[PDB]
From Swiss-Prot:
Gene3D superfamilies: ABC transporter type 1, transmembrane domain, P-loop containing nucleotide triphosphate hydrolases
Known catalytic reactions: ATP + H2O + xenobioticSide 1 = ADP + phosphate + xenobioticSide 2; ATP + H2O + phospholipidSide 1 = ADP + phosphate + phospholipidSide 2; a 1,2-diacyl-sn-glycero-3-phosphoethanolamine(in) + ATP + H2O = a 1,2-diacyl-sn-glycero-3-phosphoethanolamine(out) + ADP + phosphate + H(+); a 1,2-diacyl-sn-glycero-3-phosphocholine(out) + ATP + H2O = a 1,2-diacyl-sn-glycero-3-phosphocholine(in) + ADP + phosphate + H(+)
PROSITE patterns reported in the protein's UniProt record: ABC_TM1F, ABC_TRANSPORTER_1, ABC_TRANSPORTER_2
Name the record gives this protein: ATP-dependent translocase ABCB1
Listed Pfam families: ABC_membrane (PF00664), ABC_tran (PF00005)
Note from the entry: In mouse the MDR gene family includes three or more related but distinct cellular genes.
Binding site for ATP 2: G977, S978, S979, G980, C981, G982, K983, S984
Any one cellular-component term (Gene Ontology): cytoplasm
Positions bound to ATP 1: G391, N392, S393, G394, C395, G396, K397, S398
Organism: Mus musculus
Classification of source organism: Eukaryota, Metazoa, Chordata, Craniata, Vertebrata
Gene: Abcb1a
């Protein structure tokens, strides 16, 4: 509980300016319902002068002096009330902005500059929790969401709650009557909003699961593309996909209607609250004479407080996120564990070295698979020795190095270095005595001289020069422009891995180190540098007791003693050439050595014309948006007229008046609203009902016709297509509403405001065209100040932030100590650039918010000044001014809508162009009917000539090289090679997603180039390289009418017997019906491959492929697949592209395709008697 207190601590005045900021917000909020109260209470006096001036049948000539004096008095006094409140808000609005930007932002600066220092002064107290890259990624922005955990949202909530509560005090003071009513209706708005959330989840989550089947039946159909295209399941998957695009929208159309009804019910509750408040006010005249209008006006200002608490809700929901983001990471800021390793203080060891002796060491961190990183350690090495530490398997190796100079303190035991114990030493002096290398090729974004000072800061140019001569790295420094002060981009932008690495050796040598620690920094480097790095490290060696840790046995050959550290335990330990006889890790190592969703390219006009295909109907949703637009000004206009016709209606049979006014106020608003919300929901819902199936069908069944590289080398993972079938489609589903919402606000404001401007005394129309464009321009430029500074914040923070991304990865910071405080010293300047942007934007946003507030009271003051005064001097006007106030609110609601539409307008206008790109596609693999029912193709004696071929990423080398082949039925061609060889570059030609780069291929009498896709796959079948078995039942998976085969009991009897899968048709449960569900809930990989043999046997073909996923399944399917295949190919043109060595010894015709070059060639029967070459060129395969 309560920890919202902690986000605003370093001293005392931290809380003081926050409390003054919330007080300024409270009194700023109170000025708004006070202005509405003043504007209401003067409407009663204006109407009271109207009640004299209408009844003075023989006296209005005296009112032309006496009432006129009273009107020029009130014309004068109103200006005092407008001016005093109006000048006051300019200050307190600016103070509320100063609170949000500056009173908060000063805490954010010294919260990040507590956190940064705190991490590199807590060590074990962060290492054992969260994971690499993902931890420090969160810590970029949760210390930004902490600003909303202290944000304006709390001042908005407090000024709303203060106007609501103070509204009930002043409310009860004018009367209990309406006070009780506003208290009672408030929880009904909260309860109905609390119902909206349940009207979502209880059917959104079912609509998601209804479509989720066509999530799988999108991904599996785009992933297993070869299996579903070659077998022709593309025909079944025409409606089997689209079935889910029926059920999910049959749920969705019900939920859309209940959602629009739930929103229309909230608007009906609001308009019912207006009618009830009016009737509870008329029954303060019509009962006992408690009202002269003036008791009711206050309750309009109480409703302004109540609807302001309604605006505080989504701001408090945004804070309910930021609240969590704040205290859930604040664990690692104030009150966090702090230092184990004495990372500050301690007494300096003038011992200058000691004997290296781990004793009873453990370290318990669960490695995400091991218990402990370090499982137990005891070792002893003396001054004047070296030691190699070597291993391969499990964690723990790099843990030992952190303990060996106390960057982490050992949980169990101790480790000696120096003579006073490691739990007594001063950290800085031990960090001088010990030199430390590290594996990462990090130079930081500063000069070579600075990059050496991160070794120790207390350094001359002579110490830099000698260190780069010792490391030998001097030569390439003296070849760089500006030499030691060579300018450097992020992570060493102009230098190779090993060119950074060589300078990291000099960075250790600038300690003049008395002991040396090494950490993999010459294992798998850029090999020019790897040779020079050994030759540089071996000069940092031997002038001290040193460890060695690298894969390169060269560096290990200098060792008097070696230790086998593996998994984080010590095992092997002996002299180096004894360990070469033992066959320890040293000898073992010698024998090992010797997503783009919505992306920017739009295409205008072509987006617009697509709607002629989709909208033969449903455009009536625009008429629904027009009447829904006219509803918004109508509630303001009807209320405004209903009050004025009561206040200068007056007492004479006020029930005949009030009952008729109450009936008008409810009927025109509540009933028309609820009907309009239903009409809008039905039309928008049924437009969604056609579009949700049609748009996904058009795109998904254009991808599932799409030729050339799109399934051969698209570099997308399959889900990177489904992410577009989600996002780009969702932005367009947003625009489908937002472009109607633009018409809605155009009728609400620019249409109805002009019509209402016909029924003013027209001078107020000249005022309205001065106010409404200016307040629209104000919000329309304010949104540019807000978004433009919120964008500028990112470049000012990121330029201030490269120097943090360089270091919130590199936990090695503590290994020099000085560089922690070097970093926080520069961060004090750099994070003050974004705080100087908080100062810049506090000044601007204070002017903007005070101006946007000023235009409100200015418009109200001008409205009454040109609705009384010079107007009443001609003839007594006493109402209609509220219809100008209404039209000013039509401007305000348009600003509160056109701003919100802008990000939808930006996204969806690009999204539609990705939908266009995929619908147009490319022309080569649809269907056609060029060459069906070909009798000469009922053998498949395939002819190839001059064939050169290479898959779309051409640096993979051409796999076919100019080849000519002349095959026959009754013979088995085999591909031979090893890693990656042959497979994909055969299949790409056989489905003809792209033809040769030179040469051509005839299946017989015509090129494959000239065939129709559907009848080509009358012959095609494949052993599915995915063990895929799609949906519903095994009967629905065996056979489909794609081209020229049956779907019947006899074809599935044939295919089940000839595939040997009749094991499960004759014996066992479920059988042809088998309840596979989605992807085969009760079947092995081998049983799924047995149904691949059945899907091929449904051809009864003259050809065969033979492929992978054929000897790693469940053993009984692997033997049964071999028992079928090697008894069912001897009458076909058979082509094995499987690596499985059995098939290669059971073949007829062979080519060894060594990296796409021919190396050996012959009949298998010519080759089979040959071994040595025709053993090794097969047994090297896979």
């Amino acid at each position: 509980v309560s920890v919202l207190t902690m986000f605003r601590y370093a001293g005392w005045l931290d809380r003081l300016y926050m409390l003054v900021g919330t007080l300024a917000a409270i009194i700023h909020g109170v000025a708004l319902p006070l202005m509405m109260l003043i504007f209401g209470d003067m409407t009663d006096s204006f109407a009271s002068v109207g009640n004299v001036s209408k009844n003075s049948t023989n006296m209005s000539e005296a009112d032309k002096r006496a009432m006129f004096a009273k009107l020029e008095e009130e014309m004068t006094t109103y200006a005092y009330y407008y001016t005093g409140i109006g000048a006051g808000v300019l200050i307190v609005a600016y103070i509320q902005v100063s609170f949000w930007c500056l009173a908060a932002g000063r805490q954010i600066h010294k919260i990040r500059q507590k956190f940064f220092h705190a991490i590199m002064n807590q060590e074990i107290g962060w290492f054992d929790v969260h994971d690499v890259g993902e931890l420090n990624t969160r810590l970029t922005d949760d210390v930004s969401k902490i600003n909303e955990g202290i944000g304006d949202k709390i001042g908005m909530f407090f000024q709303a709650m203060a106007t609501f509560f103070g509204g009930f005090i002043i409310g009860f003071t004018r009367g209990w009557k309406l006070t009780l009513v506003i208290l009672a209706i408030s929880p009904v708005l909260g309860l109905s909003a609390g119902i909206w959330a349940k009207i979502l989840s209880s059917f959104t989550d079912k609509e998601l699961h209804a479509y989720a089947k066509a999530g799988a039946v999108a991904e599996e159909v785009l992933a297993a593309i070869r299996t579903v295209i070659a077998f022709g399941g593309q025909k079944k998957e025409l409606e089997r996909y689209n079935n889910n695009l029926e059920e999910a929208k049959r749920l969705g159309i019900k939920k859309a209607i209940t959602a629009n009804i739930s929103m229309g019910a909230a608007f009906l509750l609001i308009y019912a609250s207006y009618a009830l408040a009016f009737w509870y006010g008329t029954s303060l005249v019509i009962s006992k004479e408690y009202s002269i209008g003036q008791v009711l006006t206050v309750f309009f200002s109480v409703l302004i407080g109540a609807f302001s608490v309604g605006q505080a809700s989504p701001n408090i929901e945004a804070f309910a996120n930021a609240r969590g983001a704040a205290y859930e990471v604040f664990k690692i800021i104030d009150n966090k564990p702090s230092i184990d390793s004495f990372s500050k203080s301690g007494h300096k060891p003038d011992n200058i070295q000691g004997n290296l002796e781990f004793k009873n060491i453990h370290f318990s961190y669960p490695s995400r698979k091991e218990v402990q990183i370090l499982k137990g350690l005891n070792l002893k090495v003396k001054s004047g020795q070296t030691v190699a530490l070597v291993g391969n398997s499990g964690c723990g190796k790099s843990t030992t190095v952190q303990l060996m100079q106390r960057l982490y303190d050992p949980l169990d035991g101790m480790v000696s270095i120096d003579g006073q114990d490691i739990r007594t030493i001063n950290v800085r002096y031990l960090r001088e005595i010990i030199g430390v290398v590290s594996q990462e090729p990090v130079l930081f974004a500063t000069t070579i001289a600075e990059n050496i000072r991160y070794g120790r800061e207390d350094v001359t140019m002579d110490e830099i020069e000698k260190a780069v001569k010792e490391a030998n790295a001097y030569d390439f420094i003296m070849k760089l422009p500006h030499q030691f002060d060579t300018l450097v981009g992020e992570r060493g932008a102009q230098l190779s891995g090993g060119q950074k690495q060589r300078i990291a050796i000099a960075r250790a040598l600038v300690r003049n180190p008395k002991i040396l620690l090494l950490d993999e920094a010459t294992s798998a480097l850029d090999t020019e540098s790897e040779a020079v790095v050994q030759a540089a490290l071996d000069k940092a060696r031997e002038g001290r007791t040193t460890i060695v840790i690298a894969h390169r046995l060269s560096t290990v050959r200098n060792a008097d003693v070696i230790a086998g550290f593996d998994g984080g335990v010590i095992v092997e330990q002996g002299n180096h050439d004894e360990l070469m006889r033992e066959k320890g890790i040293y000898f073992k190592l010698v024998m090992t050595q010797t997503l783009d969703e919505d992306v920017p390219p739009a295409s205008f006009w072509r987006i617009l014309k697509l709607n002629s295909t989709e909208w033969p109907y449903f455009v009536v949703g625009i008429f629904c948006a027009i009447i829904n637009g006219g509803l918004q000004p109508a509630f303001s206009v009807i209320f405004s007229k209903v009050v004025g016709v009561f206040t200068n209606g007056g007492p004479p049979e006020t029930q005949r008046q009030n009952s008729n006014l109450f009936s008008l106020l409810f009927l025109i608003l509540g009933i028309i609203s609820f009907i309009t919300f239903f009409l809008q929901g039905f039309t928008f819902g049924k437009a969604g009902e056609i579009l949700t199936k049609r748009l996904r069908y058009m795109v998904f069944k254009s991808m599932l016709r799409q030729d050339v590289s799109w399934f051969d080398d698209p570099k997308n993972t399959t889900g990177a297509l489904t992410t577009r079938l989600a996002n780009d489609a969702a932005q367009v589903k947003g625009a489908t509403g937002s472009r109607l919402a633009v018409i809605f606000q155009n009728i609400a404001n620019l249409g109805t405001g002009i019509i209402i401007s016909l029924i003013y005394g027209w001078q107020l129309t000249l005022l309205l065209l001065a106010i409404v464009p200016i307040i629209a321009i104000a919000g329309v430029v304010e949104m540019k100040m807000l978004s433009g500074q919120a964008l500028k914040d990112k470049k000012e923070l990121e330029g201030s932030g490269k120097i943090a991304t360089e270091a919130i990865e590199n936990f090695r910071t503590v290994v020099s100590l000085t560089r922690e405080q070097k970093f926080e010293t520069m961060y004090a300047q750099s994070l003050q650039i974004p705080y100087r942007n908080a100062m810049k934007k506090a000044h601007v946003f204070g002017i903007t918010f005070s101006f946007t507030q000023a235009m409100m009271y200015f418009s109200y003051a001008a409205c009454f000044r040109f609705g009384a005064y010079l107007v009443t001097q001609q003839l007594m006007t006493f109402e209609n001014v509220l219809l100008v106030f209404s039209a000013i609110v039509f401007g305000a609601m348009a600003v509160g809508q056109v701003s919100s539409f802008a990000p939808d307008y930006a996204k969806a206008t690009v999204s539609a162009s990705h939908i266009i790109r995929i619908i147009e596609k490319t022309p080569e693999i649809d269907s056609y009917s060029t060459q069906g029912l070909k009798p000469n193709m009922l053998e498949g004696n395939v002819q190839f000539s001059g064939v050169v071929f290479n898959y779309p990423t051409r640096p993979s080398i051409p796999v076919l090289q100019g080849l000519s082949l002349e095959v026959k039925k009754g013979q088995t061609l085999a591909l031979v090679g090893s890693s990656g060889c042959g497979k994909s570059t055969v299949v790409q030609l056989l489905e003809r997603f792209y033809d040769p780069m030179a040469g051509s291929v005839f299946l017989d009498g015509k090129e494959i180039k000239q065939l129709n896709v559907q009848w080509l796959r009358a012959q095609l079948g494949i052993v599915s390289q995915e063990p895929i078995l799609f949906d519903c039942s095994i009967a629905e998976n065996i056979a489909y009418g794609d081209n020229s085969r049956v779907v019947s009991y006899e074809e599935i009897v044939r295919a089940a017997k000839e595939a040997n899968i009749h094991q499960f048709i004759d014996s066992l449960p479920d059988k042809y019906n088998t309840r596979v569900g989605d992807k085969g809930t009760q079947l092995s990989g081998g049983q799924k491959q047995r149904i691949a043999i059945a899907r091929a046997l449904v051809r009864q073909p003259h050809i065969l492929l033979l492929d992978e996923a054929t000897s790693a399944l469940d053993t009984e399917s692997e033997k049964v697949v071999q028992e079928a295949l090697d008894k069912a190919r001897e009458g076909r043109t058979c082509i094995v592209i499987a690596h499985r060595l059995s098939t290669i010894q059971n073949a007829d015709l062979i080519v060894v395709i060594q990296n796409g070059k021919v190396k050996e060639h012959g009949t298998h029967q010519q080759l089979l008697a040959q071994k040595g070459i025709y053993f090794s060129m097969v047994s090297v395969q896979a």
